[PDB]
Amino acid sequence: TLETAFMLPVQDAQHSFRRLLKAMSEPGVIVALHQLKRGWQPLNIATTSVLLTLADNDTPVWLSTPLNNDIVNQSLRFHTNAPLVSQPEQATFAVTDEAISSEQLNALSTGTAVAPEAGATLILQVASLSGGRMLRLTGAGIAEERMIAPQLPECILHELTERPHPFPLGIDLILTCGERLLAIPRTTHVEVC
Amino acid sequence: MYVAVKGGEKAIDAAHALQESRRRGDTDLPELSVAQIEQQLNLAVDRVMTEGGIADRELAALALKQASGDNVEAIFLLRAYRTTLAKLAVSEPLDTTGMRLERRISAVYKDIPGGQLLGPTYDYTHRLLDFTLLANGEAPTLTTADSEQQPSPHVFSLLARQGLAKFEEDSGAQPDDITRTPPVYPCSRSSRLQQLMRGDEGYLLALAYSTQRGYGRNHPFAGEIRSGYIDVSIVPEELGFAVNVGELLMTECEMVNGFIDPPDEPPHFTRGYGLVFGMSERKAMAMALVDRALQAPEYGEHATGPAQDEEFVLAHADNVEAAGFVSHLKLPHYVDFQAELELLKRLQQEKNH
Amino acid sequence: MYVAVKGGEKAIDAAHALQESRRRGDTDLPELSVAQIEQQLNLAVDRVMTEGGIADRELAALALKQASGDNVEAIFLLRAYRTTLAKLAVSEPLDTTGMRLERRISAVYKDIPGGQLLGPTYDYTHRLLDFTLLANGEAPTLTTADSEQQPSPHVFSLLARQGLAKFEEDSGAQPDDITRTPPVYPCSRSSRLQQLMRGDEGYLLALAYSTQRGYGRNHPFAGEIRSGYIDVSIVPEELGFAVNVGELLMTECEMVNGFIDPPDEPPHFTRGYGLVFGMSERKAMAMALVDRALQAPEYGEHATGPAQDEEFVLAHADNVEAAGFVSHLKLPHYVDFQAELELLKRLQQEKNH
Amino acid sequence: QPLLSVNNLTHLYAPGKGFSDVSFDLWPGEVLGIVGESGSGKTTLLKSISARLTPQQGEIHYENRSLYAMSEADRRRLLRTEWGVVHQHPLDGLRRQVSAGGNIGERLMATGARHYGDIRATAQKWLEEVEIPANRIDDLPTTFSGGMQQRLQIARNLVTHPKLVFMDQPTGGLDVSVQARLLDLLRGLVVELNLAVVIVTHDLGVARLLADRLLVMKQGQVVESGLTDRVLDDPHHPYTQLLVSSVLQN
Amino acid sequence: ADTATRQHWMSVLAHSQPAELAARLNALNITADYEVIRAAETGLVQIQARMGGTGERFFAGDATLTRAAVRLTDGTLGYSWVLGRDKQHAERCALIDALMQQSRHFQNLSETLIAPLDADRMARIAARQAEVNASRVDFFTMV
Amino acid sequence: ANLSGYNFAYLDEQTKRMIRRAILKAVAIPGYQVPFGGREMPMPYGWGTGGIQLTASVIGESDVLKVIDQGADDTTNAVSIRNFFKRVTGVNTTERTDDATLIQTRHRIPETPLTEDQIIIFQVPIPEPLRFIEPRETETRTMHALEEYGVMQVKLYEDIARFGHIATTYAYPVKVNGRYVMDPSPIPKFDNPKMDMMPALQLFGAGREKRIYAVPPFTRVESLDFDDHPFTVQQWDEPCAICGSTHSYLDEVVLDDAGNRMFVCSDTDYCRQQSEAK
Amino acid sequence: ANLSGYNFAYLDEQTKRMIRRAILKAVAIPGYQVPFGGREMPMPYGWGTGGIQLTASVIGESDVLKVIDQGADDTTNAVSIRNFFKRVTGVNTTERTDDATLIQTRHRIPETPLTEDQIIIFQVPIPEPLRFIEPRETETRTMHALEEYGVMQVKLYEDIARFGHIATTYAYPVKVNGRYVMDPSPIPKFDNPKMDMMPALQLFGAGREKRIYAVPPFTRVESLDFDDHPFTVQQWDEPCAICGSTHSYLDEVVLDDAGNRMFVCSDTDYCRQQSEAK
Ligand SMILES: Nc1ncnc2c1ncn2[C@@H]1O[C@H](COP(=O)(O)OP(=O)(O)NP(=O)(O)O)[C@@H](O)[C@H]1O
Ligand SMILES: [Mg+2]
Ligand SMILES: [Zn+2]
Ligand SMILES: [Zn+2]
Ligand SMILES: [Zn+2]
Ligand SMILES: [Zn+2]
Known part of the structure; x- marks a missing residue:
């Protein structure tokens, strides 16, 4: 009854991590995680691949109610052994959909100034990575500027364009659609165009 | 004119062979057994087990034999081997x-x-x-x-x-x-x-x-x-x-x-x-x-x-970290030392005039 | 009624015999030779010679054998033996x-x-x-x-x-x-x-x-x-x-x-x-x-x-002085500790009332 | 609107040690002197309002921003760029192993200065301002005398042209001549640059010539406050009358 | 009583010397087909000690631990967790645990295998206690 | 192919996963030292354990690995690390920077400019640029947290006042993304400019100190200096005695007791390219 | 007779001569710690090397040696030292204080008063009474040189203010000849009065610290105290359970886990005398 993880966990995890590193180090670049044929629905291929690559017993995982399913939870526990937490503030990795609320977004741990790596990484499943409001990205990982038009919630666009949190505090966003992934670290400066 | 030649790998192998030969010592004397070290050098084994993090007398004695009696080297060997073992x-x-x-x-x-x-x-x-x-x-x-x-x-x-x-x-x-x-x-x-x-x-x-x-x-x-x-x-x-x-x-x-x-x-x-x-x-x-x-x-x-x-x-x-970092000075450092030499020579020239 | 009995000397002899037996270990295994320690445990011998103050590999290996591999004990043995030798x-x-x-x-x-x-x-x-x-x-x-x-x-x-x-x-x-x-x-x-x-x-x-x-x-x-x-x-x-x-x-x-x-x-x-x-x-x-x-x-x-x-x-x-003074805490200290106990009990009684 | 506002501020190490129920407003271009008995809590209050001591009660608002509700980074930025702090003992506000030039230039570089020559020139200018010879710029403060160290600390905390300066007996250790020089410098900064100063002093003459408003503190409570000359010449609370009667007439 | 007896015989197997256990098992000549569910695996057991022996826990290093799992034809599962790195000893211990879980072998092995091993261990302990007790310092005798 | 009996890259998947999370965090916070539960490697601490762990966590089967120490591939420790990685991963290896996908270096950045998809991994003994100023981590953590870098500026000012120049000649502190002060590893001041807006990702591993920090591609990296004392790189009056280059970092080789000496490129691959061009 | 193959008393004549000169100097400067080139003994440092060396330098063929640790002759270290001295000198030994010519003790002075021509040698771990106040010898040397003992008085005053009593219960500092502040070795406060005007010579040896100091016979030794906080010795509500004495220092013997315990004389010879009297 449980879902299936990577056919080759070592090689597949390494490939997925390299793709995610390419995405995060170069914000706005879309990468494809083709190693996993099928995702743990409602989780897409990219989200499942990221969870398998990074999540473990040391990383609490919070799943939004739309994405919280018994089969998904059991598969995550069996394959990664990552504890599941019902509150976003207890999560190292947060998985949500377009229905994420501002309260949930603001409840995510942003770390602290002395330990800015203690915050949560938000995995957001977007309807598409391409058909939304044009966004100009500048900052580390971007030579001049990157034009990406992800379809995003308004709380997420607010987070990106305003940056309420003072660096080094922040949330790193991972926009997943199907087998394709985009990364926006807390450093990236985002302007609506 | 000088041309660069490969000398690192063969020199390393020769040094390791020399160290192994010195560890074996005179072949006339019988080679030490790990059981002998475990039984008759029990206190060195105890220290190696305590500092290396594994309570296995045989492994500590093996590390001591491989380390030619060097407690620091045996401790590091045991700790590194600890890394390769799963926590059951x-x-x-x-x-x-x-x-x-x-x-x-x-x-x-x-x-x-x-x-x-x-x-x-x-x-x-x-x-x-x-x-x-x-x-x-x-x-x-x-x-x-x-x-x-x-x-x-x-x-x-x-x-x-x-x-x-x-x-x-x-x-x-x-x-x-x-x-x-x-x-x-x-x-x-x-x-x-x-x-x-x-x-x-x-x-x-x-x-x-x-x-x-x-x-x-x-x-x-x-x-x-x-x-x-x-x-x-x-x-x-x-x-x-x-x-x-x-x-x-x-x-x-x-x-x-x-x-x-x-x-x-x-x-x-x-x-x-x-x-x-x-x-x-x-x-x-x-x-x-x-x-x-x-x-x-x-x-x-x-x-x-x-x-x-x-x-x-x-x-x-x-002692793992301390010994490693102290011994790392034996590694080549001529890039950093060249930087310091350039600065020092400029300072000497400036003070001279 | 209790009467004092002699227990120190025989207990000391029994402890020394136990330590010697543990040093020898299982008699099935051959006893370690000093030459083997000198040749195949050369680095421990080097440390023992350096810290003990005598540059004699055989003496350092003998101390290591007598010390059951304890570097501190072997070093102290070599230093004490240094005391018995004249400066030629x-x-x-x-x-x-x-x-x-x-x-x-x-x-x-x-x-x-x-x-x-x-x-x-x-x-x-x-x-x-x-x-x-x-x-x-x-x-x-x-x-x-x-x-x-x-x-x-x-x-x-x-x-x-x-x-x-x-x-x-x-x-x-x-x-x-x-x-x-x-x-x-x-x-x-x-x-x-x-x-x-x-x-x-x-x-x-x-x-x-x-x-x-x-x-x-x-x-x-x-x-x-x-x-x-x-x-x-x-x-x-x-x-x-x-x-x-x-x-x-x-x-x-x-x-x-x-x-x-x-x-x-x-x-x-x-x-x-x-x-x-x-x-x-x-x-x-x-x-x-x-x-x-x-x-x-x-x-x-x-x-x-x-x-x-x-x-x-x-x-x-x-390490001779430090190890000796740290181990001296194993010596009986009940006279001094009794003095401290008397003071502490008086302090507790005074604070109670 | 006040540059600094203090409301019901209280910090007590123990009953009677510290300050309790302290409130006052400070505007740009004025001096609020604090005078009182040795042991009234003047230094504790100065530390609390300077972001160096978290209060047990009350609030402090700087430019309408609660001082201690802000992040520690923001308070350190304030103390690093636009806040000056002069300690009673100069070495407490100085780097012992750093030359006088370095002590003055740390603040300048913290404000964005990145030209060594300009920083050196500014440090020498401020040393001459407090009458310290410019040839002592490279000498460590340990070689300076008490008055020299105090003046070096004052220059260090005034080089950045700050907007708010908390001083604890800045005139201590200063001969009357350099003291008058410092008073003129502070008056000029306050009037021309709209600087605000909270000064704790026991020399009531310096408070008369410098402070625009006064607080009189005793056993951790503000007993009398108001216009400096009104308080000194028309005291109301018994302590203030004792205090001004104890002045040595010259 | 099954849990306590299983704990006792597993402890006896774990504390048993590999050589004597192997010799006794060979002498018994027990015929039993089993499949190794988990191949003997040597890893580490993290040691937890207590401050002052009774206080807060803290990690006092690690120790080598070998674990093995076997299955008998009837589905009985035998397990072994033994300090050290002797894989064959762990496999034997798991096999003996599986056999002890069987009615036809429990009594026979208790009377012929577990009890002699425990008696030998107790004798070795008794003897070393006798040798160690000679170093005791006598101060007073109650007359 | 990996046939050494160990897991691919010698690290268990849990350690790889933890190091990967640390790397992602470091990329998200450029210049910040991310603590990580580093393990003891077959090499002693201080001999490149952090870089080895980073390479193991990032290296794949298709990667081409270049290992250089002091800019030379034939350096003893570089040879040891390359042989270890060949044994435990079986990956392809090259001495050519432009053919390499992963570059593990100690104290040098290659003269050849790096390209996209390339990762250069630095071996870092001291990941804290303020360590020699403040030896205690309890204080440097807060100083980085609150951007209290004034002590570094004081140190530079005092160095200029005392010697007339900044005394730091290698591991020269840099400012990353205008915010974090970072130690670039013991590379000479010569290599610091290469870090600015570099198309290749930069990863830094201090295994003994248990720190990982990264510089994403195309990130501002500015060496701390003054307008009237601008950042200046090491210079030599002699070109390389082998290839004749004048734009490469030079190591000094002493030929005899009399005093004869020569200068040759530290980057052996660049020297080979330059000699084969002419 | 000495038949162990070593020199009489195991020490070469040069070391004996140096220790003898040090002893004479210490006698001439009561309470002053005389440095001496102590050698490593068969016993580890801190186990009585200084006392062993002093006994070796002073012991003769006709001497009767008594060795006590914690006041007991049968104590393990006392037995070891006595056996060593018998092996290397062959001298007569006794457990009776009044029959002994040389007494080497650790942490006790015998209850039996000492007589003329008797020498009691103390094993001293810390010869500096100010060490626990000022750990550095560079400062304590000057403090003794200039009679700057104010820190000790401050320590006693603070102890009285804090606990209501002086916290030092053993190795209680004393004033010798009205001038030097001396550590009496870790004897309890109980034994300090015995040091005042003692007919027997007192010698103190700290081998690890390389110090020898002496109290000549009939020398004033006054424990530091205050008029309203006079020097008070340890007391017990129970007499010795063996001999019934009430004027002897008592060691506590725990009989069982329940809580039963008894108190018996630390000085075994005095207990034997007292039991044989009644
Ligand atoms: N760290 C402390 N711990 C406990 N009590 C303190 C502490 N500091 C001050 N007290 C007391 O707090 C009261 C006020 O301290 P403080 O503010 O420094 O006095 P002050 O008015 O500045 N005296 P002065 O410097 O002579 O003008 C005094 O009774 C101090 O003794
Ligand atoms: Mg004050
Ligand atoms: Zn180095
Ligand atoms: Zn002691
Ligand atoms: Zn060249
Ligand atoms: Zn008695």
Whole structure:
């Protein structure tokens, strides 16, 4: 009854991590995680691949109610052994959909100034990575500027364009659609165009 | 004209071959066996097991043989091998009250329940080089007494039942594990003890000696030193009930330390704890003394010696890191030294004119 | 009613017999020979010779065998035996330029006159436990090159001829001997070096590591490490001319340290020196680093770490004294502890009412 | 609107040690002197309002921003760029191992200065301002005298042209001549640059010539406050009358 | 009683010397086909000790631990967790645990295998206690 | 192919996963030292354990690995690390920077400019640029947290006042993304400019100190200096004696006791390219 | 007779001569710690090396040697030292204080008063009474030189203010000849009065610390105290359970885990005398 993880966990995890590193180090670049044929629905291929690559017993995982399913939870526990937490503030990795609320977004741990790596990484499943409001990205990982038009919630666009949190505090966003992934670290400066 | 040639790999192989040949020594003499090192060099094995982090006498003896007797190299070998092994279980908390006693002494009372059990020790021996060991000899035939192990309650339990000391009480706090998370200062006492057990014997000995000489005095008394076999038990998920997996030879040291006068309770002795693999005791005693020294924040003590400096003591206690970083100076550094030479030559030229 | 009985002597004899039996181990395994320890555990022998103060490999191996591999106990055995030996002569000053080189490296230049001679070393080895050593094996057949030892001038001589460093110059001052006169702080550099050579390897390693981590930084570079055989010569009163008495395997380490800018001469690198018996190098490197740290008074440096504290470093460096004083807590202390108990009970009673 | 506002501020080490129920408003271009008995809590209050001591009660608002509700980074930025702090003991506000030039230039570089020559020139100018010879710029403060160290601290905390300066007995250790020089310098800064100063002093003459408003503190409570000359010449609370009667007339 | 008896015989097997256990098992000549569910695996058991022996827990290093699992034809599962790195000893211990879980072998092995091993261990302990007790320091005798 | 009996890259998947999370965090916080539970490697601490762990966590089967120490591939420790990685991963290796996908270096950045998808991994003994100023981590953590870098500016000012120049010649502190002060590893000042807006990702591993920090591609990296004392790189009056280049970092080779000496490129691959061009 | 193959008393004549000169100097400067070139003994440092060396330098063939540790002759270390001295000198030994010519003790002075021509040698771990106040010898040397003992008085005053009593219960500092502050070795306060105007010579040896100091016979030794806080010795509500004495220092023997305990004389010879009297 449980879902299936990577056919080759070592090689597949390494490939997925390299793709995610390419995405995060170069914000706005879309990468494809083709190693996993099928995702743990409602989780897409990219989200499942990221969870398998990074999540473990040391990383609490919070799943939004739309994405919280018994089969998904059991598969995550069996394959990664990552504890599941019902509150976003207890999560190292947060998985949500377009229905994420501002309260949930603001409840995510942003770390602290002395330990800015203690915050949560938000995995957001977007309807598409391409058909939304044009966004100009500048900052580390971007030579001049990157034009990406992800379809995003308004709380997420607010987070990106305003940056309420003072660096080094922040949330790193991972926009997943199907087998394709985009990364926006807390450093990236985002302007609506 | 000069042309670059490959010399690194063959030189490295030749150096390793030379080291191996020196380790083997004269082929006329029979090669040392790991069992011989384990049995007849048991104290070096104990130190290697304690500092390397694996309580396997055979592995420690193998590391000592591979290290040509170098304790630092053997300890690093054992630690690196620890990295390659998976963690199968976490043992249930050890119960030192159930130790089978090879040795048990107390310096705070002339006699105690269970008696003063000297056991195997070099204490009180006249350190005169025994040249008869240059040739094979016959081990002494041991005399015997009754075989019952008399009850041996911990001396600190006796002190606490009198109100002179405080029981060490378990609040259920999850111990910190510096083998998975890097230490964060100030570290908890669990982390401090874990690091001290892995710390260099000589460095902690020197720090404890300094404390004994006023550099952060704690007025120590060897309340009790117990060496013997403790059973190790686990609770595998397959069965769900405790299973005993064997016994480990360990040494435990409890130090009574200068009494305090807390605002809202009777004055009482403080305490320090040390725990090591094997029969070696001085490491455990130094561990207890340095633990008491580092307990200063919990008592609001004005530090008067480096042994009370938590970051200084712990950041340099692990001989693995210290030895590696000191030996890394042997690595090529001509790029950095060339930078310094360029700066220095410019400074000399500037000062000359 | 109780009556006092004699138990000390027989208990001591039984404990010593138990320790001897444990040292021998299982009689099925052949007893270890001192030659085997000398040849195949050469690095432990080197440390024992260096810290115990006698450059006799056989005596150090015998102490290690008698100590059951305990380096501290073997070192103390060798030092105590040193006490029983008469001083027949004082060697002429050693000439390290005449060393026959088993190993010679420099981290400050990519290549130097004489080349980078790695020699026998564990450096660059992958520290993986070699389980094939659990059984007897065949030592590698060593490859060979030309037998000429190319000229190997000291790197510091090259630096000094360029003006980048200062020659160490002999003023004829009589060296201080802490083996006959107790040290008086501040000690001269000769006394400091003599004590450091006898100091605990681990303690000095930790201090040098702390200096490398900013606790009294000196910006060290391994200017040159030379291991090999140096001839020892004396001038007996019977003959009146120098006679060569043999050769000693020694390791010398010269550390280039952060340059200064003296008021009345060009800025130049400072230096630290280490010298040990045998092939072990980390002790010599730590000795040089701590010597540079303790040279602070001669340079007016603001101390920023314990390694620059002369009295603290030297008063606790000798593992003989430190280990003895830490282990002395195992001695009966019930008289002193009874005094403390009387005071503590009176304090508790006074606070209660 | 006040540059600094203090409301019901309280910090007590123990009953009677510290300050309790302290409130006052400070505007740009004025001086609020604090005078009182040795042991009235003046230094504790100065530390609390300067972001160096978290209060047990009350609030402090700087430019309408609660001082201690802000992040520690923001408070350190305030103390690093636009806040000056002059301690009673100069060495407490000086780097012992850093030359006088370095002590003055640390603040300048913290404000963005990155030209060594300009920083050196500004440090020499400020040393001459407090009448310290410009040839002592490279000498460590340990070689300076008490008055020299105090003046160096004042220059260090005034080089950045700050907007708010908390001083604890800045005139201590100063001969009357350099004291008058410092008073003129502070008056000029306050009037021309709109600087605000909270000064704790026991020399009531300096408070008369400098402070625009006064607080009189005793046993950790503000006993009298108001216009400086009104308080000095028309005291109301018994302590103030004792205090001004104890002045040594010259 | 099954849990306590299983714990007792597993402890006896774990504390048994590999050589004597192998010799006794060969002498018994027990015919039983089993499949190794988990090949003997040597890893580490993390050691937890207590401050002062009774206080807060802390990690006092690690120790080598070998674990093995076998299955008998009837589905009985035998397990073994033994300190050290002797894989064959762990496999034997798991096999003996599986056999002891069987009614036809429980009594026979208790009377012929477990009890002799425990008696030998108790004798070795008794003897070393006699040798160690000679070092006890006598101070007073109650007359 | 990996046939050494160990897991691919010698690290268990848990350690790889933890190091990967640390790397992602470091990329998200450029210049910040991310603590990580580093393990003891077959090499001693201080001999490149952090870089080895980073390479093991990032290296794949198809990667081409270049290992250089002091800019040379034939350096003893570089040879040891390359042999270890070949044994435990079986990956392809090259001495050519432009053909390499992963570059593990000690104290040098290759003269050849790096390209996209390339990762250069630095071996870092001291990841804290303020360590030699403040030896205690308890203080440097807060100083980085609160951007209290004034002590570094004071140190530079005092160095200029005392010697007339900044005394730091290698591991020269840099400012990353205008915010974090970072130690670039003991590369010479010569290589610091290469870090600015570099198309290749930069990863830094201090295994002994248990720190990982990264510089993403195209990130501002500015060496701390003054307008009137601008950042200046090492210079030599002699070109390379082998290839004749004048734009490469030079190592000094002493030929004989008399005093004869030469200067040759530290980057051996660049020297080979330059000699084969002419 | 000495038949162990070593020199009489195990020490070479040069070391004996140096120790003898040190002893004479110490006698001439009561309470002053005389440095001496102590040698490593067969016993570890801190186990009585200084006392052993003093006895070796002073002991003769006709001497009767009594060795006590904690006041007991049968104590393990006392037995070891006595056996060593018998092996290397062959001298007569006794457990009776009044029959002994040389008494080497650790942490006790015998209850039996000493007589003329008797020498009691103390094993001293810390010869500096100010060490626990000032750990550095560089400062304590000057403090003794200039009679700057104010820190000790401050320590006693603070102890009285904090606990209501002086916290030092053993090794209680004393004033010798009205001038030097001396550490009496870790004897309890109980034994300090015995040191005042003692007919027997007192010698103190700290081998590890390399110090020898002496109190000549009939020399004033006054324990530091205050008029309203006079020097008070340890007391017990129970007499000795063996001999019934009430004027002897008592050691506490724990009989069982329940809580039963007894008190018996630390001085075993005095207890034997007292039991044989009644
Ligand atoms: N760290 C402290 N711990 C306990 N009590 C303190 C502390 N500091 C001050 N007290 C008391 O707090 C009260 C006020 O302290 P403080 O503010 O420094 O006085 P002050 O008015 O500035 N005296 P002065 O400097 O002479 O003008 C005094 O009774 C102090 O003794
Ligand atoms: Mg004040
Ligand atoms: Zn280095
Ligand atoms: Zn003692
Ligand atoms: Zn070239
Ligand atoms: Zn009695």
